[PDB]
């Protein structure tokens with residue numbers, strides 16, 4: 028626990044520590060192998076986003092019981108490459124970053140599972156599976172989106188969702204041109220044991236070539252032995268997931284719905300609008316599983332493999348609501364993630380051989396600023412759990428989408444080999460940390 | 469060393485790690501006493517600021533040999549308190565934040581060494597000196613400015629530089645009303661062995677009461693046994709500093725000039741103005757010591773003391789140039805600090821009983837964004853060491869001054885007790901960390 032000790036107005040009352048950490052920390056260090064790994068990604072979840080969520084939901088002196096509880100921490104850099112020059116491109120997108128931690132190679136913005144030369148490289152999930160480990164890939168995004176796609180698809184543009192877009196935009200990748208296929212087709216080939224998220228829509232396309240031609244990708248999935256679920260009760264009734272019967276959960280047509288609703292930040296909104304309180308999203312049907320519920324089932328199913336498992340969990344819409352300049356949506360998706368993280372830590376603490384990592388793909392726009400701020404972008408005032416006003420500012424785009432930022436950001440870990448996130452590292456080190464911790468080749 | 473391995477375009481070439489860190493970090497873990505501490509603060513130096521500076525000066529895959537080299541890292545919270553309510557104020561100023569790590573108690577914005585009830589609390593410097601340790605206080609700001617002033621002064625507003633402003637803004641601290649006096653008067657009473665910075669201007673005022681009434685604060689210093697220096701050569705030639713002959717250096721009227729010149733960011737500056745390369749500041753005379761040089765003399769003089777020393781070093785103008793939306797200024801001052809950090813680490817590695825800590829008082833405005841960004845605030849394109857463009861954005865104030873932000877930010881450390889900065893901590897923990905490390909009371 029790292030909440031404030033007591034009365035934050037008094038001496039020592041805002042302390043998060045109760046005693047010397049040296050012994051505890053020594054004891055947090057083990058370089059025995061990891062049997063399992065859970066990687067949780069908050070898309071766009073930089074320190075700022077963590078801090079704003081913490082402040083709103085738990086109070087400034089509060090503590091995220093998942094997010095904030097990983098004891099080994101550092102900062103890592105997630106710059107991409109300029110595709111022509113090979114030089115750094117200081118602000119990555121989700122595809123280049125996800126490619127870095129999943130393959131160990133930098134690449135250009137938009138690219139999945141390929142380097143700047145457009146050459147494929149195998150992913151941590153593929154190398155898990157090859158070693159006979161169970162594999163999970165979970166996200167609140169449409170499953171074609173960069174973050175989950177990067178683990179199972181090798182394509183020259185992240186827009187290559189299915190056959191249609193792939194033919195037009197990744198001709199080199201398209202099945203009918205002899206390539207590996209669209210992101211959705213490659214996802215079906217990769218056959219992780221557990222794949223849960225949104226993105227049903229693209230499954231309605233029919234393949235233009237290959238063994239399942241003329242059939243929707245949904246049909247292909249059924250033809251190939253996959254159990255399809257599409258809501259929380261059907262997911263919960265699944266009793267196994269393996270190579271003979273892999274699980275594919277499709278819980279929405281595009282992105283899964285956000286947990287909280289609030290208004291969009293506006294010009295001078297912290298000055299001209301009253302403070303806001305977020306509310307649970309009245310549009311999110313109770314029958315859509317949450318990210319922690321997706322995470323439960325995935326852990327439950329994968330932990331059955333005696334050899335071990337690799338699991339990626341993405342809180343995808345932190346980023347998407349940060350783009351939308353929607354503090355409540357943004358914060359709620361961070362709360363959402365913290366719940367999934369608690370699940371992971373609770374399994375990992377009891378199992379004892381599980382390395383859990385929590386970070387983001389890149390930083391974002393949202394800034395916490397003073398209540399009287401007069402800023403040129405979009406702002407909004409929030410009433411926090413402390414009963415004070417926090418203002419959030421989105422000040423880096425005049426267009427309709429607040430943009431990523433280049434700042435290094437937090438990475439934290441618990442479990443075997445967690446030492447390797449500490450100090451300054453690069454996103455590509457995380458690939459090798461994962462590879463090594465599981466003893467893969 | 470945590471530079472990129474090799475060819476950042478190739479598998480594994482952006483890695484910062486050369487192998488498994490578990491055993492190295494184990495060996496970084498000592499709970500034996502610290503004999504000395506050196507605390508370096510980059511004012512306004514958030515993770516974004518570090519990143520921008522590294523990107524520019526060392527390249528994206530580069531490594532600050534000082535700043536980036538401390539092996540035990542975490543993230544800390546620095547929210548202040550509303551004076552009336554006692555609730556968190558999510559964006560601190562430099563006075564509340566420096567009060568927190570220097571006394572271990574939160575306070576309101578603009579307060580120095582006092583809590584929200586205006587009650588004094590002892591500082592780590594005062595406590596060091598009482599235990600017989602040598603003490604230094606160094607900064608590129610005027611020495612009355614919040615960050616250095618917090619170690620030696622107790623006032624209700626940070627604006628109470630000398631007798632003149634203290635009588636009218638901090639009437640309860642004014643000497644003529646029976647208070648402890650202005651920041652400058654209290655600074656002189658506290659009598660650190662070594663005190664170096666700017667702020668000569670205020671020493672020209674005359675005291676309104678007390679033993680040295682009717683004399684200038686400069687004459688008071690002389691009369692009280694202090695050796696006064698005003699430039700690098702005179703500073704170089706000092707051979708001792710102690711309670712009989714304490715050292716006070718005053719190297720500028722107000723703030724010391726910055727190291728680098730470049731133009732101010734402007735609206736659409738990344739688009740309408742060409743890329744900038746920073747150059748050295750023609751206004752900074754060579755006779756002005758640098759922060760590293762100040763740090764050198766300080767370390768050398770203070771290390772005479774057999775029992776130990778406490779030293780704080782502030783790269784103060786990272787913040788001020790962030791305020792002024794001036795990337796070359798901001799970056800130059802971060803490079804300046806990295807040098808002073810190198811001095812400190814070199815000294816700690818050789819002496820081996822010294823805890824060194826590098827952090828910031830709070831986060832700031834500057835954001836690294838994409839080259840074609842169209843932002844509503846102030847931007848600028850810069851040519852980095854990698855021969856690529858980085859754009860920087862200042863997007864949270866339509867006034868002449870860009871504003872602090874509340875994100876938690878990096879704290880890093882090296883030496884005995886440095887475990888206590890790892891994970892999530894509060895800025896007030898840092899006080900207690902320092903205190904227990906030095907066995908103080």
Ligand SMILES: [Zn+2]
Pocket residue numbers: 070071120121346388389
């Ligand atoms: Zn992203």
Ligand SMILES: [Zn+2]
Pocket residue numbers: 070121168172173174175341343346
């Ligand atoms: Zn994503």
Ligand SMILES: [Zn+2]
Pocket residue numbers: 071121346347350431
């Ligand atoms: Zn995004």
Ligand SMILES: [Zn+2]
Pocket residue numbers: 511512561562787829830
């Ligand atoms: Zn400051």
Ligand SMILES: [Zn+2]
Pocket residue numbers: 511562609613614615616782784787
């Ligand atoms: Zn300062």
Ligand SMILES: [Zn+2]
Pocket residue numbers: 512562787788791872
């Ligand atoms: Zn400031």
